[PDB]
Design an enzyme around this catalytic site. Sequence first.
Site, PDB file in Angstrom:
ATOM      1  N   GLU A  83       0.832  -1.190   0.000  1.00  0.00           N
ATOM      2  CA  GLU A  83       0.000   0.000   0.000  1.00  0.00           C
ATOM      3  C   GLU A  83       0.875   1.250   0.000  1.00  0.00           C
ATOM      4  O   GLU A  83       0.686   2.146  -0.809  1.00  0.00           O
ATOM      5  CB  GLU A  83      -0.949  -0.008   1.211  1.00  0.00           C
TER       6      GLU A  83
ATOM      7  N   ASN B 155      -7.359   9.404  -6.110  1.00  0.00           N
ATOM      8  CA  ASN B 155      -8.114   8.428  -6.888  1.00  0.00           C
ATOM      9  C   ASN B 155      -8.910   9.171  -7.932  1.00  0.00           C
ATOM     10  O   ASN B 155      -9.175  10.371  -7.810  1.00  0.00           O
ATOM     11  CB  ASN B 155      -9.029   7.594  -5.997  1.00  0.00           C
TER      12      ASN B 155
ATOM     13  N   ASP C 180     -11.937   9.060  -8.695  1.00  0.00           N
ATOM     14  CA  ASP C 180     -13.201   9.550  -8.161  1.00  0.00           C
ATOM     15  C   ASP C 180     -13.044  10.795  -7.282  1.00  0.00           C
ATOM     16  O   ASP C 180     -14.030  11.264  -6.739  1.00  0.00           O
ATOM     17  CB  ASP C 180     -13.920   8.432  -7.388  1.00  0.00           C
TER      18      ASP C 180
ATOM     19  N   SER D 200     -11.332  11.158  -4.396  1.00  0.00           N
ATOM     20  CA  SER D 200     -10.958  10.780  -3.067  1.00  0.00           C
ATOM     21  C   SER D 200      -9.474  10.608  -3.043  1.00  0.00           C
ATOM     22  O   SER D 200      -8.823  10.644  -4.072  1.00  0.00           O
ATOM     23  CB  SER D 200     -11.653   9.486  -2.648  1.00  0.00           C
TER      24      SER D 200
ATOM     25  N   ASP E 107      -6.207   8.554  -0.728  1.00  0.00           N
ATOM     26  CA  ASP E 107      -5.750   7.483   0.167  1.00  0.00           C
ATOM     27  C   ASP E 107      -4.558   7.940   1.031  1.00  0.00           C
ATOM     28  O   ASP E 107      -3.619   8.535   0.499  1.00  0.00           O
ATOM     29  CB  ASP E 107      -5.318   6.275  -0.663  1.00  0.00           C
TER      30      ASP E 107
ATOM     31  N   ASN F  67      -9.089   5.450   2.665  1.00  0.00           N
ATOM     32  CA  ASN F  67      -9.753   6.317   1.689  1.00  0.00           C
ATOM     33  C   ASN F  67     -10.715   7.337   2.305  1.00  0.00           C
ATOM     34  O   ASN F  67     -11.528   6.972   3.151  1.00  0.00           O
ATOM     35  CB  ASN F  67     -10.516   5.445   0.698  1.00  0.00           C
TER      36      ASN F  67
END
Length: 129
Positions: free
Chosen positions: A35, A46, A48, A50, A52, A59
């Site tokens: 990760e 991301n 969309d 968002s 992380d 998220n």
Amino acid sequence: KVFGRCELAAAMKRHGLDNYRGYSLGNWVCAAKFESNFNTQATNRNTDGSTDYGILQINSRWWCNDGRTPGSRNLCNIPCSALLSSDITASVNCAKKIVSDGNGMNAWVAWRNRCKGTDVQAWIRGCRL
Ligand SMILES: [Pt+2]
Ligand SMILES: [Pt+2]
């Protein structure tokens, strides 16, 4: 902060992640590796909108508030910046919420693709825990 493999394993184990919801400690180290490459300050945008955050790439759509992910929730009731601290308490507590949510560690795509089904015990091999 960039953790050493064993260092992180020990910190996670002291924060109660060892066998939490039946996921042995190796799983969590493996997930962190892919990760964030063990880097607490890691961030990723991301498609969309968002973002992380941290060692476990949690998220902002669901779990933290970053004040620019519209309509999102903040199920862990924290600012996403809290998740970039060198002290992993915030991340661990939020991850325990996430993993109890019903998809287990499959929430974490890197875990699902890269750790699930592997010899995850390798990740803690030779550590003093
Ligand atoms: Pt700690
Ligand atoms: Pt803790």
